Amino acid sequence: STGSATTTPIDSLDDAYITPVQIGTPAQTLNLDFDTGSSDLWVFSSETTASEVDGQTIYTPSKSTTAKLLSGATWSISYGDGSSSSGDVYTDTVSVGGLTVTGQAVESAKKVSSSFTEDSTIDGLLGLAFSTLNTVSPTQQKTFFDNAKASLDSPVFTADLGYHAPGTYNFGFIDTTAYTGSITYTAVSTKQGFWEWTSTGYAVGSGTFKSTSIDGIADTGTTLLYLPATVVSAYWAQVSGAKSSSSVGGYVFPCSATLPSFTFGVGSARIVIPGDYIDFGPISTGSSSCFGGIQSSAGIGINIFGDVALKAAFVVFNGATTPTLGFASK
């Protein structure tokens, strides 16, 4: 079996991408944020405290003939950004882009933090990290990808994120029409439960490639590209008028600028992020100042190849027994 689904940015900034998913019988369509940095599938539901739901479409398990209560099971999760949610757990049929899994754990939110309440476009998350991070207890539940692997034509799923445009998530096949050249695979460490890999180095604009190991994780659920302080410092040094701003919380610069491109190694291959991808947006509508798409990882504790990096590539999440990450230009 295979699935193919369109993923669309939630706004003009590509802050995040939502992908419709069908849950229950008959099917209830919710727009979820596919998150390779976590492993919970959770949704806004009939069970979420009313004052906390805010324009989102909710999942009503009592209207699904195929839902069953996982009795005893609860969950609770917090994200890097400080947001959180908790509740209990159903199994139900879940479909993405025509790929159907039965007995998928669907985590139903009883409460949600203010961030998700204010996010009208996101009805919940679909986690695509390794199942070891799942927060359901007392027994952890498999991700949608893990449950799917038995029936997939190939145990993989590709992320094809658009620059200010829709993209695709594919399950179980690689669309050779989607990228240029060849896919370069690199080893993944599952020690911390992430899609964790090591970049072979970097270049800024048209200058020299520096071989230096950058350990980071591929996270579709993080907007920006967070690299070590001295790499980020090297990038913004090539932009006049760029400066670090305490008040905004990162490197800012004139919207006027043409930004240099940024290159990062994957084994012997090179992926080039066009400069315009790194120009995130004005810090406020009508400002001369724009927020940089590359920022320091120092405060986060881990390098993150987030959406600004990933949408410059075709990315293959190879979830064979011994996982690997594939990158191609597109």
Ligand SMILES: CC(C)CN(C[C@H](O)[C@H](CC1CCCCC1)NC(=O)[C@H](Cc1c[nH]c[nH+]1)NC(=O)[C@H](Cc1ccccc1)NC(=O)OC(C)(C)C)C(=O)N[C@@H](CCCC[NH3+])C(=O)N[C@@H](Cc1ccccc1)C(=O)O
């Ligand atoms: C550690 C990273 C790589 C993985 N991760 C991050 C998620 O992918 C998570 C997915 C989001 C959550 C919010 C809603 C949309 C989906 N991403 C994030 O939390 C990042 C973090 C970040 C970095 N810098 C500034 N913010 N959020 C973002 O990148 C948001 C996305 C967004 C889009 C639209 C609207 C709102 C928010 N974008 C954003 O802020 O953009 C601007 C900076 C321009 C404002 C996790 O949350 N993982 C959990 C797994 C939980 C498993 C529990 N068993 C975790 O480790 N949580 C840790 C937190 C942590 C880890 C490591 C170090 C420190 C803290 C914990 O236990 O608390």
